[PDB]
């Protein structure tokens, strides 16, 4: 049965550890893909980790040069949550160096972008069969979420970008039904920049929190209904969510320029005027992770907050993070439950290896007791192949 | 359908070998997790082996230092009984350095504790979805069975301990329904010590046989009904069950102080005034294993027994042991069948390696002919990684 | 339910990338079969890659000498599309050094040829059970498609060749029902040569495009109805499809003798007088791959064409290619969708290794936007075993 | 639904190759169990290979000394037919150094013998649950078929031996229902010797062809009905079936003394007065394999035969062989189809290695065209671990 997606997001006071794969530790000997850009998505029956492989295994010579983002060898694959991504346990999804995926309650939708930078093509699959494609409309790296799309009542929604990563680009919202693009809208967003959106359903509407790689240290957001009527803004909290970013201070409802260039994929959950912000602990590099509840941070610009929970230590590597939800159809609850994942990036450019790869952790929102700690990647670098 | 749990334990005259995984032997070459604290639990359709990984594989450098009990890398995972615990065949359950699991007849309950020693949190999952959490109440290594919880009529039961491992601690019993704690009781047990309980259902009541790490070389027990009304005692038999222990003498109905400090997880099955006792063969180390039937050993203090069956030879490594049961809903019998498993610990601290890991064997009680033998681990240490 | 096979081929404007397995890159470390002659075939539920193993893994000494085509160690196996062919994820099909397979909508049919060159036997299995055999009738390497057979209304069809690969041979067409040969016909085709046919259903009739290894650098074809009444010809286009071949010039409706000796397995899709041709980029070796639409190339001899889409760059290795289809029963479309795969051959005879193996890519035809690129094998040769 | 087992054995004129696993070649790199005593058995849905592992993988140090027959590390496991026996694709069955298994149409029965030579215990499991045990009655290596048991009308039948392998021993036939022994009879067979029976159903009765290890170079047989009323004899053919054996000459309907000591597990299929005999090609060692049709060989003593089909070349290693059948419930045929497997033994005692392991091939009987060839193991010895 189709996910209804019409209930509200469950309010939560804390985050309980849900999974840890130890991928890089295990890949030191085991046959584990070199990956990056992992994300989690759930069906009414199961949660899966999706990821972009480099078409190579850890500790093998073909992991050489895997700091490179886009190549014909990259593929979107998936495995059950918490298991290491191996050629022996992973399902093939598509050929992709940028991707998204989500389940509408009936079948998996996957979106995999491959091809040259000047003419990339997103291939849409529904239940593993090609159902549609869309080609680059600005000829400058067509790219998408690197996290799950959001589903409401049999329609799935995603955001794609085409154009400069360091200046004004073009941003489109899509509605997809059974793998067919049935509507798209280009956002009219002058002076905004959207990359790598983390999108979730909440009361039949979609909220996306994204990355301004151009000139924003706070995160831009876009919200829309099923007809793709939309609103845009930036998270106002002085608790800045991007990385890099400046010191916390008075915020802005527009892009905060200071340290605004570059960024990292991230997420936040809106609750009225309040916001749960996940972010790195460092203002300069992808180190640490923490969750912060700011009760008026969606719309208010002060840097006060009410709850902070430690997730990864400042002296440990982190990386991308993203939202995922668990629908009532899966959980039996009366609301849509918020969860998130964190990518723990190891290797280049911060460490002296020939490769770059990630492992992952994830957490789900609860209203019972939780504890801050650090659950880092834990691998000992360099590896044999690096010697 | 819910497991009734209302029939009695099958009377058994001996133990038939059920499984052996040869994990450490296989892990010399194959990709096998470093694990400890394995245990078995059954649904109405299958038996699974659960275990706490160290987030590392045997014969890899990340196995270095795995004598260490608690870290953020440890995860509870499971695989089909008798198969090696591998990243290619194991299902992820929970992030955990202490755990329990059982099946109510409908879905799996797992309990996984992680976090800092001074503020750990147990995460409960029902069918893999987080359903409850509970925080440490003594701030000193919140910890649980390391074997299966027990289920009666749709409720599951477990025991957790928090506080000193070398003096009076705090012991709680829980009733859990669909992964939610619906009642807990703190045991009023001054001068008793309970760790790592092996609990089983019998005529709608739960009996747990546990480990006194403080000052008892005989095993403490707690029995309770579905309302958590409980009774406590120590096994009276002069056939002492813990390790270390003194040589068999006249026993006691309270804790036997002689060699009472420290211990090993173990189990026993009560039959009226009699008891089936599983224990190491050595009185000083985790070597050997044997099953002993003492017809008056639950309540009586002499050291006379009438059946002894060899399981692991005295010159071979053993370790933890625990009960599991097979319910009528699985077996088609008219009673609950008692079974047990033994963990065979290899590596530190007794052997010259950088790592510690275990393999397992298991047996089921029958009333047909059986035989004693020795079914040891059989790996040849040290391994390549140790040289 | 049986595949009807009565609708027409979907007209297509381009080819969207569907799968890429990265087998050779991954097999540098992981346990991946040495294979050649892969192909894809679909059921109403799933698509699988079939392949002929060499009974050996990459980077192991038993890969030595695997340039050799026929041995008793070769087996037909299959795995899900896009996954690497590993002993841990592959289903065994048959013992075979030449093969075909297809699904009639109810069960898989496989055809596996093994035995001596002077008396080989094809073993037919339906749902994994042996249902028929046919022995060599010319005693000179009985051999078959190395791609999927074609099914219409509960009957499946294939072509086999027996006799010289450098001169006139004998060619038979078979109708197979539930794994039993129910009719066969020997083609009367003087001066034709048919090897390794790629056959697809289209409006209840079968069209095969094959390899002339004797004296044609264009491809021979045969089409037939369910009663095995047949027509024969060569693709007339001056855009020659075989490898090796001459530079494009005026074509022939018979075999083009210029550079006509030898060849490579290939395919083409007929649309009226037009043809989609897949071919290598190099005229002299198995390098590069491209798809070309020639609006009058089935029957016209000019070398003019409308569309070209790049698949593999001319400086990268390619190899065999073949057609596969996805029926309406799988896709929900009102027509039969054409797709194709390409084998990317690495090792001998072109590279300094002891072994020969391939990886694969595949594409499906669509009417939405697509893009040419190069999706090559990507392995770095030689491997450890070659030193 | 229960297998009826009431139709006759299909008459067959030749043997078509069914499977080949290449286990030893693949295990040179991949994670493949050291095994011996493989056998095949089918359910109404699938065919599986069963085997006795040595609790160790190929090319690892724990494969040392695996010439040894009985140890506590040996386990019965199974995998789909034609797949390599790996810890990643194998199902655990039982702890066993002698075994049998068969499917009654409803569930798998496995029988696994372990324990000391003077008191071994067979453990019976039905659907993986222990259902019965039987202990040694002569205290001298209780042992069984090492091939599939035979099922008729919901009852399964096997033969076990206890006592000397070089003189008169004790042989029992068992009827088993839902894993419970419901009847047994001790065979009154002075001067007969029965080891390692290959038994098959045929028209509601069971026929077993076994190994005389005491003083016969032809094979003993026993036939019985569902009530365990039985008859005994030896295959009369002068085409001697055992290994070692003398050169063919006039046979005996009793044990042929010449070269009678020792032997190898094998099989034969009775058709009236005639017999299909599978045997090694060498009269002195386990080399080569061939199928021979002797139209009066069940009952007549001449060495005349009418068909011979080569299976393994005389210069190649062979080993155990055994029957298995495919019932009408699986095949859709109106008779019971005879098939057989051959174990190809590599390593000790004939080759310079520290280990012994086998691969397997299998064939099914057909009435269509077939061919002889050699399908040998193909591994290159010694392995890395041997050097
Ligand atoms: C296991 O861990 C120990 C550290 O706890 C490693 O020993 C160290 O090796 C480094 C060289 O990288 C030396 O500089 C240190 O002095 C060593 N420490 C100690 C306490 O000896 C050891 O190499 C590890 N073994 C592995 C990874 O195989
Ligand atoms: C091309 C712009 C884009 C978003 C800013 O770059 C991303 C930077 C990422 C990063 O900052 O780590 C890595 C991503 N793999 C990459 N995406 C693509 C499609 O290459
Ligand atoms: C902390 C007390 C506890 C019980 C005595 O210690 C156990 C001793 C065990 C042991 O005796 O081998 C190892 C266990 N993994 C450990 N449990 C935890 C949670 O670390
Ligand atoms: C025997 C003739 C045949 C077709 C021309 O050769 C093929 C050449 C092939 C090739 O050109 O690469 C390799 C094939 N495996 C081989 N087929 C067999 C059965 O050996
Ligand atoms: C103990 C007698 C028996 C049959 C003659 O020996 C067999 C000889 C076999 C052989 O000849 O290769 C190997 C078997 N694994 C062994 N069976 C057992 C249970 O050890
Ligand atoms: C341009 C093209 O591809 N189509 C040509 C057409 O224009 C031309 O008349 C014909 C003969 O030259 O060949 C074809
Ligand atoms: C959500 O949708 C379902 C299906 O229509 C409906 O029954 C339910 O009332 C809705 N819940 C809301 C609106 O919160
Ligand atoms: C990685 O690539 C660099 C540059 O091509 C090369 O010099 C180096 O040898 C490579 N390292 C490995 C381990 O392949
Ligand atoms: C959801 O979709 C269904 C089916 O298309 C449609 O009929 C209905 O209007 C929608 N329901 C809600 C709650 O919007
Ligand atoms: C156990 O409970 C079941 C379900 O109520 C019942 O059918 C059965 O008779 C009970 N057995 C007892 C009370 O011993
Ligand atoms: C078992 O559970 C059912 C449902 O809650 C209840 O009605 C019944 O009384 C229970 N039996 C007991 C408590 O023994
Ligand atoms: C294909 O066959 C089906 C089933 O007979 C039929 O319903 C359909 O009309 C056919 N399609 C054609 C002839 O195009
Ligand atoms: C491959 O085979 C050749 C010829 O027999 C042999 O000389 C060579 O050593 C082999 N190479 C390997 C790595 O086995
Ligand atoms: C398809 O097959 C069925 C069963 O033989 C037959 O009745 C029907 O006429 C066939 N349709 C055709 C030939 O298109
Ligand atoms: C075999 O037994 C079945 C009943 O179990 C009967 O219907 C059939 O006629 C018998 N004959 C065969 C198929 O051998
Ligand atoms: C196997 O054991 C033999 C005899 O003890 C010994 O000579 C040899 O070194 C061992 N080999 C390995 C690799 O364990
Ligand atoms: C199988 O056994 C019993 C009678 O002995 C009964 O279920 C059935 O009639 C039998 N079927 C036969 C004789 O094939
Ligand atoms: Ca930014
Ligand atoms: Ca605030
Ligand atoms: Ca103690
Ligand atoms: Ca006593
Ligand atoms: Ca040619
Ligand atoms: Ca043209
Ligand atoms: Ca003999
Ligand atoms: Ca004769």
Residue numbers in the entry:
A (entry chain D), B (entry chain A), C (entry chain C), D (entry chain B): 83 to 469
Question: What do the authors report?
Answer:
Stimulated by the first neuraminidase (NA) crystal structures, the NAIs were designed to interact with the active site of all NA types. We identified a novel isoleucine to arginine change at position 223 (I223R) in the NA of a virus isolated from an immune suppressed child on prolonged oseltamivir and zanamivir therapy. In contrast to the frequently observed H275Y change, which causes selective resistance to oseltamivir, the I223R mutation conferred a resistance phenotype against both oseltamivir and zanamivir. Our results support this suggestion by indicating that a ligand-free form of the pandemic neuraminidase adopts an open conformation. Together with this structure we present the structures of the I223R mutant neuraminidase in complex with oseltamivir and zanamivir to investigate the resistance mechanism of the I223R mutant neuraminidase.
